[PDB]
Amino acid sequence: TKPLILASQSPRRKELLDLLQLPYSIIVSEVNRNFSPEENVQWLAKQKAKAVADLHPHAIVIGADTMVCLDGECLGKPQDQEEAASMLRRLSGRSHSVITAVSIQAENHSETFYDKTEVAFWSLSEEEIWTYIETKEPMDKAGAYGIQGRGALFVKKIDGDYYSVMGLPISKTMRALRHFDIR
Amino acid sequence: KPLILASQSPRRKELLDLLQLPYSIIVSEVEKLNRNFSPEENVQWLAKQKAKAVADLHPHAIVIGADTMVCLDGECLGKPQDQEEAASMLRRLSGRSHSVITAVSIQAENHSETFYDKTEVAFWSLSEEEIWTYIETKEPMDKAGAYGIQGRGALFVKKIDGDYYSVMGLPISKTMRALRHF
């Protein structure tokens, strides 16, 4: 048996991993154009898990990364408030992909995968964009929106995993951890 | 006009709270869904009856009523009566898809609007151990179809095609949009 480590500072990933009712600890570590968004998100989840697994080689380390992509271009956490409003205008009245990769690392076993969810947005007004920006909820999230909180009002529907949109495909994470014998 | 949520559902309360609008919770018990009607007709009839019953008591108000059904192969599943029935319902939902239909009815003296939102829910194949341990925490017993998308029930869901909030009992983005019409 090996102790479980969540290599993430994300409160959403913490809340989702708590659903497993498995004891674990949290450690956050210090974080290519030729790659596709699918390769990039998998690579980043891997680097996050490996940085902590290198420091604690006796444990099972979970790393994850979430990207918001549309027409091949991915949107990261917006630096400015105007950039956050620009991302929202691009997302308005259409569909985009939310890609979440998970990497599970142990000395004798490693597993990396991504989950893709299609997210459809209603057509949004300028007023709704800035009043949502004022809440401070967009700044912390990729693509300048969260499916929870006030961001829930922009979402018309999804085709995929809501928990994966939050930052962790918890049902798949649970299934992958069974082959690490959970502990 | 003042806003009334004709539901005691904590999930519908937490969702209607996202709107940042003042409202009160008022309920009046209504029940029998006829087999001659489709589940889509019935769920809308139920959301209507719940809102109308409270609207008759508060005719100056805007009243929101809602109802949620979990259906597969035209058959809809209610809250389980016993743990053996809850395991029967989950065994049926395992390894396949079902529909979650939520109807919302907004009632006022000069305007009324009813609609349903349909979501496809796909489950992983479930073991007998998984079903009984989930039953052993009493989360199924309170819910239609013997499961919830939140909590330990989250681990059974493979994917959805629709609205997660509608599965919780309220399509919050459609409701918000419909309240602008009022």
Numbering used by the authors:
A (entry chain B): 2 to 32, 37 to 188
B (entry chain A): 3 to 32, 34 to 185
Task: Quote the passages of the study that discuss this structure, keeping the authors' original sentences.
Maf (for multicopy associated filamentation) proteins represent a large family of conserved proteins implicated in cell division arrest but whose biochemical activity remains unknown. Here, we show that the prokaryotic and eukaryotic Maf proteins exhibit nucleotide pyrophosphatase activity against 5-methyl-UTP, pseudo-UTP, 5-methyl-CTP, and 7-methyl-GTP, which represent the most abundant modified bases in all organisms, as well as against canonical nucleotides dTTP, UTP, and CTP. The protomer structures of the four Maf proteins revealed a large β sheet containing seven β strands (β1 to β7) with two α-helical subdomains on one side and one long α helix on another side.
Previously, BSU28050 has also been reported to exist as a dimer in solution (Minasov et al., 2000). Analysis of the crystal contacts using the quaternary prediction server PISA suggested that the Maf proteins form dimers through multiple interactions between residues located on their C-terminal regions (155–183 in BSU28050, 181–202 in ASMTL-Maf, and 155–193 in YceF). In BSU28050, the pyrophosphate-like molecule is coordinated by the side chains of conserved Ser9 (2.7 Å), Arg14 (2.8 Å and 2.9 Å), and Lys53 (3.0 Å), and its position is similar to that expected for the β-γ-pyrophosphate part of a nucleoside triphosphate substrate. Near the catalytic Asp residue, there are three conserved positive residues (Arg14, Lys53, and Lys82 in BSU28050 and Arg24, Lys65, and Lys100 in ASMTL-Maf) whose side chains have a trigonal orientation in the active site and are arranged similarly to the triphosphate binding site of the E. coli dITPase RdgB (Lys13, Lys53, and Arg87) (Savchenko et al., 2007). In contrast, in the structures of the YhdE-like Maf proteins BSU28050 and ASMTL-Maf, the nucleoside-binding pocket is partially occluded by the guanidine group of an Arg residue (Arg13 in BSU28050, Arg12 in YhdE, Arg29 in YOR111W, and Arg23 in ASMTL-Maf). However, in the structures of BSU28050 and ASMTL-Maf, the side chains of Gln153 and Gln179, respectively, are oriented slightly away from the substrate-binding pocket; therefore, they cannot contribute to base recognition in this conformation.
